[PDB]
Amino acid sequence: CNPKSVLKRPVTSEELLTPGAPYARKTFTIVGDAVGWGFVVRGSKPCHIQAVDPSGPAAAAGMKVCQFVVSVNGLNVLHVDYRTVNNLILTGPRTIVMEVMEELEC
């Protein structure tokens, strides 16, 4: 019971890949901060966003909790582990280019 899971959607693999229908893609560019970006991604295959700091810069520029990401700073990370993406975001520049699936209330 040690891990925590807040994502209602069980799996989105191939559900996202299909064009149109449930979601509309959006690209979010987040600038680095002295206190950090303040977001966590804990999706195995789809790498869904686990939590977002409400007072952080990400929450100011949208970035709601119920989202999925497929590409970071240009590189497409649709099918990798969340920790591997966590390595990429830390090793990348201060400003991060992020694509959010942003399901439309479905």
Binding site: G32, G74, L90, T91, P93, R94
Partner: protein, 609 residues
């Protein structure tokens, strides 16, 4: 410094004049007090531009003081009642700089100007407006002290038939509503709609935009960035060197703007100026009937002149806001762009092609007239951000763009400077060009060309196995070292020395290059000397056999200049220099720490800050 500085003070009141005031501010950095008050009064009474340059510059640097505030307050209070144009705006900026000094008299001085500003609400009315606008930016607290008089007097004075008031008073109402939103709105909309019901047209639209623009910055953030057009994982050095009604009435603000999108088609350039800025940001909140009233005024102004500059900017915001429905108006918008470019103003055309995609494969064909326009900072910033947002053919962008660079860098002065900025601004994919550029900077008497061409070559050597390539880099870096040692202009020496980054330490560590660097340790400029010992100290691990004997001689000299020279500056410079040695060459200095520490303790027990 009384009469000799009065000779340049009279030459400042009579390009060089702005530099004479900049040198006065620089003279205030090093700096009797009575003579400066008399010299400021001498320039005041005579001319008024140099007097404001004398007052404001000294107050900022020398520091606000009770004596200085009590005297110069009377001078500033005299200028405002009656003054010439241009001089008035300079005197109002000198108020803002005084009000941001952070003194005890600031509470009295600011509230003295604000109370008199409310009395007025034409060199009297516009002066009070510039005072309230700058105080709203600089001082939010005391600007909020009088909010109820603020709105009531201003909504009367704004709608008078004047242009200078309408330009400034809306920026004051803008500065006020930003402070009000972060912390009235009913009294604003009431007086605005009363005023709207042809001078009383273009003012209401700015007020209506206040509810739309502040509630949604998303519209402004795109326009604000186009108008202008490190790493977290780095390891620190082991030795630390010393250091509501705005959204509910949003569409309503547009509903009163939609009627003001076709009513004032062609009245009286001034009214059209306010319409063409606001319409895209109002539509960006809620886009077609609103657009149709926008499109009638905006599209007609693009063909016309004196507005074409703002016309594409409004259309560029409109292109991002209206995504799908804009495809109907593709033949209308694209025909003006295809006609506007051949004449070469068009700096906006490229910015909006970036904002138009912000897409189709047609844009690939649209590049060949776009590039034929000419080298501009907007075009190359766009094409860089074009490959950022839509990297469908990043290679084809770089393929065509390099063909442009080849034509440019094969064959006046300020363009080649910007052409080097072009070559050096954004990423690219250059051997012959750089070996030919090694001739140009040597054979150019232009200071700015040499200073920029240096930035270029050091940047284009970032890929740093073929022996010939190494020998070429060695040749280029040898030419740079020669320029960095022998060039008279220390600015060029400053750029070159700064350009010798971590990347080049493999090349600088060569024996021949290190013998040049040693000569550089006897440079006229101490700061370059400082930076050189840092580079040499950093290389003392790579080639200690050469570097450590040479730093030992330098160490003795540093301690000699410290102990035996009886001069503050030289001793001060020597300590600073020994600082850079300790940090950059710690191995050398550890065995000799006890001598150094005794010398430093003796300096601590000496009887300049």
């Amino acid at each position: 410094x009384x009469x000799x500085x009065x000779x340049x003070x009279x030459x400042x009141x009579x390009x060089x004049x702005x530099x004479x005031x900049x040198x006065x501010x620089x003279x205030x950095x090093x700096x009797s007090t009575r003579f400066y008050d008399q010299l400021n009064h001498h320039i005041f009474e005579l001319e008024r531009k140099g007097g404001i340059l004398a007052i404001a510059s000294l107050i900022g640097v020398e520091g606000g003081n009770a004596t200085r505030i009590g005297r110069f307050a009377n001078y500033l209070r005299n200028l405002l009642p009656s003054n010439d144009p241009v001089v008035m705006e300079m005197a109002s900026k000198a108020i803002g700089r005084l009000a941001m000094a952070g003194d005890t008299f600031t509470a009295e001085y600011v509230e003295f100007e604000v109370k008199r500003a409310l009395e007025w609400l034409e060199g009297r009315r516009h002066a009070a407006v510039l005072v309230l606008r700058e105080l709203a930016i600089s001082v939010p607290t005391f600007f909020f002290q009088q909010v109820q008089p603020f709105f009531d007097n201003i909504f009367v004075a704004v709608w008078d038939p004047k242009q200078a008031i309408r330009e400034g008073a809306v920026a004051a109402l803008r500065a006020c509503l930003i402070l009000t939103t972060q912390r009235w709105y009913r009294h604003t909309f009431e007086e605005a709609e009363k005023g709207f019901d042809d001078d009383r047209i273009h003012g209401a639209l700015l007020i209506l935009n206040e509810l739309v623009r502040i509630s949604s910055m998303e519209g402004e953030r795109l326009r604000e960035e186009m108008e202008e057009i490190m790493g977290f994982g780095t390891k620190p050095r082991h030795i630390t060197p010393f250091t509501x009604x705005x959204x509910x009435x949003x569409x309503x603000x547009x509903x009163x703007x939609x009627x003001x999108x076709x009513x004032x088609x062609x009245x009286x350039s001034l009214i059209q100026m306010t319409i063409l800025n606001l319409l895209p940001r109002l539509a960006a909140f809620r886009p077609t009937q609103y657009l149709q009233d926008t499109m009638n005024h905006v599209l007609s102004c693009v063909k016309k002149e004196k507005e074409r500059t703002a016309a594409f900017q409004a259309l560029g915001l409109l292109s991002v806001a209206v995504r799908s429905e804009f495809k109907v108006y593709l033949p209308r918008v694209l025909d003006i762009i295809r006609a506007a470019l051949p004449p070469k103003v068009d700096a906006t055309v490229f910015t909006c092609i970036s904002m138009l995609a912000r897409i189709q494969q047609d844009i690939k064909e649209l590049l060949e007239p776009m590039l034929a326009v000419g080298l501009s900072p907007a075009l190359t910033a766009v094409l860089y951000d074009l490959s950022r947002q839509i990297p469908q053919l990043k290679k084809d962008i770089q393929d065509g763009l390099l063909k442009m660079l080849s034509l440019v860098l094969m064959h006046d002065v300020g363009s080649i400077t910007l052409a080097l900025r072009t070559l050096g601004s954004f990423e690219f994919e250059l051997t012959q060009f750089v070996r030919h550029c090694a001739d140009h900077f040597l054979n150019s008497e232009h200071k700015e060309i040499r200073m920029e061409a240096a930035r270029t070559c050091s940047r284009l050597l970032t890929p740093s196995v073929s022996q010939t390539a190494v020998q070429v880099v060695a040749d280029v870096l040898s030419k740079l070292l020669v320029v960095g040692i022998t060039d008279p202009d220390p600015d060029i020496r400053y750029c070159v020395l700064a350009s010798l980054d971590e990347r080049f330490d493999a090349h600088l560590a060569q024996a021949e290059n290190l013998q040049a660097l040693f000569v550089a340790l006897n440079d006229q400029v101490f700061e370059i000397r400082e930076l050189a010992i840092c580079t040499v100290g950093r290389l003392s691990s790579m080639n200690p056999a050469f570097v450590m004997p040479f730093l030992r001689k330098m160490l003795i000299q540093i301690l000699t200049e410290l102990e035996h020279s009886g001069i503050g500056r030289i001793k001060e410079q020597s300590a600073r220099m020994l600082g850079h040695l300790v940090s950059n060459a710690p191995r050398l200095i550890r065995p000799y720490m006890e001598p150094i520490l005794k010398a430093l303790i003796l300096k601590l027990k000496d009887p300049n800050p």
